Symmetry: D2
Subunit: 343 residues, 4 copies
């Protein structure tokens, strides 16, 4: 089969041919129909600091994908051959304290498909049977392929007190932030403010947000004061940019909540007293997807039509042309790019 791999400790990826993996007990073989690309994949590709401390070549990458269950291992009762599925990238241990608590999304021994073991940028991939989420047969694979990143948005948005009937500020219009914009709008947030310095990304958030802000042309804190009268009740942070983080926290009203998915590249200077403790703020560290309630909430929204992810699918390319694909992503000229492993 065809597969995109990182064969050595350097830049780029390579198209190779590998035998079809085989599912043993508790596993299933999945025929990949669509897969997507995100920041993690871009770290691997550029072979930067992050990638260097986490990746161990050889590795077939790809952690955002959907396909059909082509085979199951001995004893696997579910899913079943023929089922259409989306995949949870985190493989949890079930033998640590986080798992005991039900906090699977932060399992101490978390292993990630396409990062720690072979992923979905291939025609076939073997994953744990418990990691498969069966979708309605009419759900387009393309959309099914991006439920994983969508989950991140969902998790962030519904963490804490949620967003229904509350003012919200989203800092970062990257793909997950655009997705969170769709979710807060379909959840009854209002007013909704989305802030991002890149025009191309902001635009994508226009049909959902009530006010778009380019922190580099308007004083975010002041637009917020004029839109709400003071501050927002909720801050959803997806960029990791330190100045946005500080601005965003200053934007919260006392007693508010900041939910943080964004990963800053370096430690930040933080005024614990001023930005959190003294104003009674609660900061939520968001990681992964809550195992099963995040998937339940998110697929509920998509299956029923409360949200429509389609406009986020800016490009479709055969896996063969992966280079053009990463290029588009890397340049900010795309939101969700789909790769087809059959071509």
């Amino acid at each position: 089969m065809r597969a995109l791999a990182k064969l050595a400790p350097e830049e780029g990826l390579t198209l190779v041919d590998r035998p079809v993996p085989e599912p043993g007990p508790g596993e299933i073989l999945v025929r990949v129909e669509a897969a997507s690309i995100c920041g993690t994949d871009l770290h691997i590709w550029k072979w930067d600091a992050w990638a260097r401390g986490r990746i161990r070549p050889p590795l077939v990458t790809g952690h955002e994908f959907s396909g059909v269950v082509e085979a199951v291992g001995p004893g696997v009762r579910r899913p079943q051959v023929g089922d259409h599925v989306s995949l949870e990238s985190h493989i949890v241990c079930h033998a640590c304290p986080a798992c005991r608590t039900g906090n699977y999304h932060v399992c101490l021994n978390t292993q990630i498909l396409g990062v720690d073991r072979d992923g979905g940028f291939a025609e076939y991939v073997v994953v744990p049977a418990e990691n498969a989420w069966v979708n309605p047969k009419d759900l387009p694979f393309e959309v099914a392929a991006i439920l994983e990143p969508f989950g991140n948005a969902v998790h962030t948005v519904y963490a804490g007190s949620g967003v229904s009937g509350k003012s919200v500020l989203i800092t970062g219009a990257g793909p997950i932030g655009l997705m969170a914009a769709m979710v807060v709008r379909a959840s009854g947030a209002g007013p909704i403010l989305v802030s991002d310095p890149n025009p191309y990304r902001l635009a994508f958030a226009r049909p959902y947000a009530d006010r778009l802000v380019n922190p580099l042309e308007e004083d975010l804190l002041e637009v917020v004061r004029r839109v709400t009268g003071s501050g927002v009740e909720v801050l959803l942070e997806f960029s990791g940019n330190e100045a946005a983080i500080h601005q965003g926290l200053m934007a919260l009203i006392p007693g508010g909540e900041a939910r943080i998915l964004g990963i800053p590249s370096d430690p930040i200077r933080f005024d614990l007293a001023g930005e959190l403790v003294m104003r009674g703020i609660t900061a939520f560290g968001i990681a992964g997807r809550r195992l099963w309630q995040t998937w339940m909430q998110g697929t509920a929204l998509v299956y029923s039509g409360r949200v429509d992810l389609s406009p986020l699918l800016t490009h479709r390319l055969p896996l063969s042309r992966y280079r053009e694909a990463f290029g588009l992503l890397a340049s900010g000229q795309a939101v969700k790019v789909i790769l087809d492993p059959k071509a």
Copy 2:
């Protein structure tokens, strides 16, 4: 000044002339621009048991109204003359276990506007300044007049775990239940099911629900099963109808939540163990509006446009044609009737 009052211990109300009242300390004088009527007012109309043991004539009725701050009492600094406001009907004592605990919606010393003291079915009314909710000048008074009953819906929907990304069954398509349908739809619930025997009421929910059900014509359970695959996660009960209550609980998946606003006219037969305990169901008794939180969530929905309450106002009549307003009520025909105290 024209006012509509219950002058003696009997059915009906009487159109009267009273001098314009004056606000003392801590009070304001509202020039009412719009009022609405609901079941409570009906109880007072027909002078039934309830009214009998509660109303003390002479009394200007009405608790659902909006208007303008004509003048304030000495030392009152909020709201201000010229402010457009809606009224919270519950006047809380601030001196009971319920208020201390922050459960003002259930103050044991609750004094209701229009039942225990003069209400808004008049050109002017004096009320506690703390009961006034200031609205943007551009919100129609007609809509502002129904924010109180809308709050009841809001309170029921956001109670417990909310409804975002969840399957919801709403029993009762009367005015409040209908507002609930608008809210759960704008809050991202899905699938959304609404059940009520009256096809008139049920049709108002078509643009908000995913599935409409007349339980007298279809098996509600079998329909819930076909739409969700089993049960709903949330039950929102507005009818107080015993059969609907029993059926709704059965449609709830184990571990789900039932939030009850509906008041049955008589005790029900309840299999505590089978309908609640053994299935791990939690039942929420909803009453009033959480003081200020319910108003914040609801008005945010309205102000931002997440929900549009216009479709619920079927009739606007002059206060002097009240005989007909109370008839529409007792009959069913309308959803929410507005009364114009200036005519």
Copy 3:
């Protein structure tokens, strides 16, 4: 081995000799060191209505027990041979909506050890590997044997808003109610009131409760008003007695919580409006133990010494003398009776 069984659709149980069960994939063989008896077992014994609709002879009963892992099935990584364990009686399916939600305690396909399949009133018993909770080797088996019923108390007490710094009323001094009395006292509840008509049971609650009440000699509602000044914030109901339920709910303050574990023998007449909806009460149906957080909280309390269950172990008898054992229980002359299968 020795085992206590229900061999036919009638009263009583029978001592028999059966081969030692064998653990297959995903299972473990447990050598039982101690087991206890409760109401469920008494239903089976008396072969009453309940038992008749649930039991299917032949059945080795016993669902409250602890022992040592004597053997594990092929592939079972944990627990391990030699481990000391307590057992969760509920065997969950992992393929229903409750399980999906994490509400394992109300799994639609729940199977119960000692009720639906052979239990612990035997020298040996095979249970699912995932149902074993490993205890510190120095925890006395006797105490380990009663962690299952303890969990019920724990679940009830920590459901909702918990009990820390709140007035609590416990109706029912049966064994789980006494256990809940120990837990609310070790949790910072205050004042704590325990009410039960049986003197022998009340007494057991004296070192934990702040006020003991015999509803049949004092007006429960009035003692409560004098102890708190109005009502309690939390009601923990363990009896299922209808008058206690009504009394208890009347005892709650508006906005309070009632957590119900008690199973009434017959439907009750319930004034939905008066007892729940109008006073903003929230009723929690408690079933089983939350899979893992209930066990985490409860074993934490026991391992650290925050609670000491020992005084509840009123009797110890070899399994051979099971009849005297059930007799004591049936007569209200005991709290937790331990049966030893080795004799």
Copy 4:
């Protein structure tokens, strides 16, 4: 009347004579029976930056006091002459986003007793009637005097998911952290770990903690590991010490909660991604006392006897010997110092 005041922009305080103030509308006149001092008072004492940008002489300091209602203002009906009361130092505006939302503890217009206006370091003080908490006549005034700072602890412990049945690490054994230790012990936490370099402070917690740790002498992490098997579920931070903050977060299991009352004197270096985001940690900024809830939980603990605050009062000095009280403070020696304004 004797009072202790900051009369000019400099260090120190001055013992003075003022006429007994009179309560206007909505106010009461408290005859102070006991007052206490904390770090804030110290800031005012040494007149540092903080005090500099906040205090406006002439000002009678003190915010931790208890006393008797000597007389009430016209029309004040609660509390009453003769009532023993404690004072909430925060005077809230009831006109900001924070108050509307019910987050009075963080009112943007908070006016503090003894910092923005006359306090209790005097024989008499006039305060808003709504700030008085009525105590049972038999509670010692000395203990009643420290309910305010105790509330800070209470608020920190019960924030988030509470602590019952959970493993807890408390960093900082100063007065508040020590009160926190008493509360978490009385609330059923276990194992309970308390870390602080000062062996004087640490010894006060011996009767409440399960494990005492001097982090300068032992590796806090390795100790937490040996006591829990991994990490603690809850982190309660009271020191504001950057090193303790970083170490405590590391000791928290993934998905745990950190509740921070501690105010660092300077911004910290914070690895947002590593210490919060990637581990799914939630950090709670705790400030003040939740208005009325914190007081209800705390006083219930005290009134019922779940906690005994007596051990925390090391010294009781006449107000006139304040020079020494402020010395004990700045030095460490004592826990809580009481000042008797009648001498």
